[PDB]
Design a protein around this ligand. Structure first.
Ligand SMILES: COc1ccc2c(c1)O[C@H](O[C@@H]1O[C@H](CO)[C@@H](O)[C@H](O)[C@H]1O)C(=O)N2O
Ligand SMILES: COc1ccc2c(c1)O[C@H](O[C@@H]1O[C@H](CO)[C@@H](O)[C@H](O)[C@H]1O)C(=O)N2O
Ligand SMILES: COc1ccc2c(c1)O[C@H](O[C@@H]1O[C@H](CO)[C@@H](O)[C@H](O)[C@H]1O)C(=O)N2O
Lengths: 491, 491, 491
């Protein structure tokens, strides 16, 4: 109550279930953990600005001014990884910390910071995987031309990426250009609950003077073009040794038909196309899914022949951020239905409950994460069978422990997160057993952090951040399981 | 709310899904519809007695004194069958109406009644299937020696069966010796909620001076012996033409493991053994399931070599009464668990909710019937693969519309029962497609009737009985669907 | 005659059929090869005592006083392994040689011996796998409190294990707490043909004053508790580096239903539960198989909550000792059958001949080993599908060349053993191909040894021991095949 059944002990994954090359790690993002939002010359990002001018748009009215203060305490992050025996760490680089004005002079203090983190990770036998952008846009560019709604963001992003390549490319060999593009577009320009908080007039978001049916697509189109330019540059001048890889990380939910009928089967396909295909298909074949173009038309920008070719095969590795799944319920095209939110264009509503009234799976804490590991295996098999089976990393996976939930009184006793993670690691094993080329699993939540519009009320970390005890890092039950799982020598 | 999703129109069964020989019908039982409990010489049954001396043990404090008064209105029952186009009608013969004293002089008025019903069914091109006993024991024998708890019931039942064979055998060619033996033993001698209402001292039933760990098995053992004797007699003297068939109808629930583990897989097997195997395995191989003997031991009577042989292969046709399914949760043998109810001997608790917290299926009205058609298909495939694939008839299948349920305001608008029935008829099609030898489907509920301890508060009929309008028969939406399904000529 | 068909040359396993990490080795046990039964302070074991006071209980009236004299000639054992190119050697440690009185002062001469063997194996690039106990109990403890029939054996064994851990744990990283627990209990306390030779009064064994229906279970229960204590200690203080593994080696026979019927299918499951589940299920879930508890009841000791948890998941690696298979024939529960031997509790007789009269497979020499490689593959797939697919090593596998068998005139020309081994190695390949996590194959019989109650009359070695030529080691045809198989450089 809420009845949460755990795996039988013999069904718990062991490290040897995966080969020696498989990689276990954890992930974080700059704004969610760094803090020092205006220290040593760092310029403001769209999230600094969003929180500072519309504080009420954050659940518990908190922000990322300090977060986990990883800007100063990064050594503790490295130690937590080491203690758990993680082989890889995926973190993001703050665009505004590197280039305070989005463009122009680079902030050497910013470059020094990341070089320290990188060298520390390497000193501790941990491989650094870098996310170039994680919703982290310089407010300078946002003020100048509307950030990602303007084509100028394409070359500006390219230059930013190049700064990262030349300064860290000698040690960092794996990159992700963008993180969760679909969620970013939906929340930042559709519902407007995320920075810059734009939506259509009449809707309830910070700044209701956008267009929920167009801005999300405009932003997504620029993201893809920026990605294409950065990768072309990378392949041309920053992979001389031939051992570097660059890709993108997509946020994806699994889908099951709401009701067993060919209609909901088709709806499920439209849902996958919209959630995953939106940004994956372009980097694979150089164009959006046919379903999206047929339903969105003029509101979805066309690619030029040159862009199409630039985008096709522009990923060496694919990142999949997976948390949950939904039932896909078919919506008919008729005068009775008129899209108002970009997500309406899929003509498939995402339902948490199936045709028999049952939830897709056990709730895990935060309202949107229902546990359904099968969904991940299915998505991985689609990557294999439909998209050429490219190298895939689960770049995000986990659950939140919510404040106020009395079934989670001890923040360190996260047996629920542990069971969830073990089940998804097992689901990845199933996919690998079926031929999917899955290369690693990065738990979302190296440490508790600023969970965007939900503030700190949601704890996603393997490692607790004691905000009342100087932001101390304290390993949770889940983290300790990893220590054992990874055979970390005992003190 | 309660969200009840209906089949898509193209998923609705058509009569031609089944071959020309397949049989669609409906069922009833003497005490549940006849009435005239003491008319024309009929003696009292254990249910007349149970209701008359412990009226409070019936939900709405009603009884079967008149029920649907089919004793007088049987012509209306025949007409309802005809109007729906049913090919078969399965009804039961009242032991106490035929032999008021259980033994001795036969009540000619009783014999005349059934001969009228039989001839009327034949006159209307409907084949009569007869259930010899349906919990319908003469209170005379109950008073004399404890009814089914005494071995004398074996020969008395045999003589009763013979009276039926010689008087109706020239026209009736298909028989079921007993109906729902497992439910009868569990409720009449375990929980004691059914006549004669016996249970262990300290338990809450009409007469708590029995033994819930022994009487159920004693009664079941006598039922099997009685069955064996009746069939031997039938095969020897009442099947001279070789075209008659006799079997038994078993009440069965489907089972799914509570949690995915070999332990609950084993628990599911024990549940099937206990619910279905208890009486099916003896008529198949001549002995109870091994699991039951290993867990019940001395409390489960042994069969003699002669009885074992008499029982083996004693069924020409199998009847399956299916309504719902449950999850089977494993219970360990230990000092912490001590059986008190016969059902505890299976060491597998029947759960309505799975390991993920979800109900097995949509509720349909009465509290114990959750919709799960897959369960029926699975049981039918077990009959095929494990028990020799004998001829099987779904002798009971349906749901109840409960009084007080405001989501069912019009008693004739039973679209929920219709959807449920269509789904189970489809499930039978699936089994047939997979090789199961299923010969027919009899809906439980030709008409609303006396639903034992729940009185008339539960309406299971395809045909409404207007108790306020002289017990008039009125076809419900479900019944009208059958008229179309069966291509009945229109007036 | 006996017609023994060999594999076609293209069906013979090649080393590259298995990956680089797969391990090929051979096994032995202290009492079967060491000799020097009372040298340098070693105290007597239950087998020294058994042979010395009941010499007639040994087939050819021989014993292990000297055996292969490996106490002095261990260098020759190491050389044989090297010559065959074996990567691993699994040997056992003599409890009585380490602690002459079972408890107390450690015999330094014993510790020095094993340190020499270990260092020699390492010097020759061979990894040592150690079996802590192989039926090898100190007669001191047997005299003091009845050995394994007394709970005191639990802590005494624990202390013995600790002595092994602290003295050899720096170089030995893989352990097996006990070997063939099922066979030990059945033969030592059921039939009593093995030391201490106990059985029920009226039976024919050395000391018929035990209880074949209880002592086997009492001994097995103490074995499991001892195992649990030793592993907990190991994990807590002797795996600081996280690279050590400890498990158990189970003797297991494959089973096929005697006749094709659900009854023999159920019997097969009971046979597997009894032979393999008896000790495997406790180390997996912390309790005996349900079938055993349901049939053995009070004669099978209960585990406490603490013990159950201590036992669950107490194995890092599983050892499977496989030689043959049998048909499982169902036995009904009835007054006509009363158990007298512990093995009777499975209600499934192990038959060498099937329902069609045919033997399960070709005889190989000794009367109990019929060749049936399919049985091993099936057991390995059960480990995978039912028990979580833990790391498995075939810790024993082979056949005997019997003295007096004129179809085996040249003891070095063991082409039959070679064919048998190649077929089982191929069977392991099949299991691996189907997903079973099999890590290695250890042939039973590094060299001919003392085969318990059959003395030296049975030769199980890959390497001949010329007892008439100073116990010289001479490679047989099988051994030479391994040299080629393993690509050992030629002289
Ligand atoms: C607010 O509800 C919600 C619904 C769907 C999704 C999100 C949020 O965000 C997810 O994206 C990740 O969320 C985690 C946990 O909040 C963040 O820490 C990560 O930075 C973010 O990528 C999800 O992708 N999206 O579907
Ligand atoms: C009272 O709850 C309950 C639970 C399980 C079962 C029954 C009742 O009775 C069922 O047997 C059939 O029930 C129908 C509907 O009440 C009657 O009209 C039939 O006469 C009876 O055979 C079911 O078999 N049993 O599992
Ligand atoms: C005596 O017949 C017999 C029947 C079954 C079994 C055994 C003997 O012993 C086996 O155990 C292994 O046997 C080999 C060969 O004799 C010994 O050298 C090993 O030490 C022993 O583990 C088998 O497990 N058992 O089923």
């Amino acid at each position: 109550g809420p009845v949460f059944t755990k795996l039988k002990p013999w069904q718990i994954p062991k490290r040897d279930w995966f080969d020696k090359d498989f990689l276990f790690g954890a992930s974080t993002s700059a704004y969610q953990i760094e803090g020092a939002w205006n220290e040593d010359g760092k310029g403001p990002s769209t999230w600094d600005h969003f929180c500072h001018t519309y504080p009420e748009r954050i659940s518990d009215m908190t922000n990322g001014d300090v977060a986990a203060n990883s800007y100063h305490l990064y050594e503790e992050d490295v130690k937590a990884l080491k203690d758990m025996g993680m082989k890889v760490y995926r973190f993001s680089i703050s665009w505004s910390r590197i280039l305070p004005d989005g463009t122009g002079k680079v902030n050497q203090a910013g470059i020094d910071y990341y070089n320290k983190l990188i060298n520390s990770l390497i000193d501790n036998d941990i491989v650094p995987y870098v996310t170039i952008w994680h919703w982290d846009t310089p407010q300078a560019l946002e003020d100048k031309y509307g950030g990602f709604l303007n084509r100028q963001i394409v070359d500006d992003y390219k230059q930013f990426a190049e700064v990262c390549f030349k300064n860290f490319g000698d040690r960092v060999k794996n990159w992700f250009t963008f993180n969760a593009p679909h969620t970013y577009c939906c929340f930042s320009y559709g519902e407007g609950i995320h920075a810059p908080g734009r939506c259509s007039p009449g809707m309830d978001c910070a700044v209701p003077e956008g267009d929920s049916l167009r801005e999300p697509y405009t932003a997504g189109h620029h993201i893809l073009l920026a990605h294409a330019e950065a990768v072309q540059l990378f392949k041309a001048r920053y992979n001389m040794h031939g051992d570097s890889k660059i890709g993108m990380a997509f946020d994806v939910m699994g889908y099951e038909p709401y009701q067993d009928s060919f209609l909901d089967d088709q709806a499920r396909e439209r849902s996958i196309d919209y959630n995953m295909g939106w940004f994956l298909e372009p980097v694979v074949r150089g164009d959006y899914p046919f379903s999206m173009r047929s339903l969105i038309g003029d509101r979805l920008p066309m690619f030029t022949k040159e862009e199409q070719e630039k985008l096709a095969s522009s990923c060496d590795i694919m990142g999949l951020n997976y948390y949950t799944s939904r039932f896909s319920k078919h919506v008919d095209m008729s005068p009775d239905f008129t899209p108002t939110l970009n997500t309406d264009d899929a003509y498939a509503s995402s339902e948490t409950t199936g045709s028999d009234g049952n939830d897709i799976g056990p709730i895990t804490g935060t309202y949107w994460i229902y546990m359904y590991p099968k969904g991940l295996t299915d998505l991985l098999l689609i990557m294999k069978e439909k998209y050429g089976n490219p190298p895939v990393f689960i770049t995000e996976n986990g659950i939140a422990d919510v404040e106020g939930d009395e079934s989670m009184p001890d923040p360190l006793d996260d047996w629920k997160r542990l069971d969830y993670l073990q089940r998804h690691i097992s689901a990845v094993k199933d996919a690998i057993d079926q031929g999917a080329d899955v290369r690693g699993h990065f738990t979302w939540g190296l440490i508790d952090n600023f969970e965007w519009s939900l503030g700190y009320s949601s704890r996603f970390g393997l490692v607790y951040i004691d905000k009342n005890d100087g932001n101390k890092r304290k390993l949770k039950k889940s983290a300790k399981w990893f220590s054992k799982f990874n055979s970390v020598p005992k003190p």
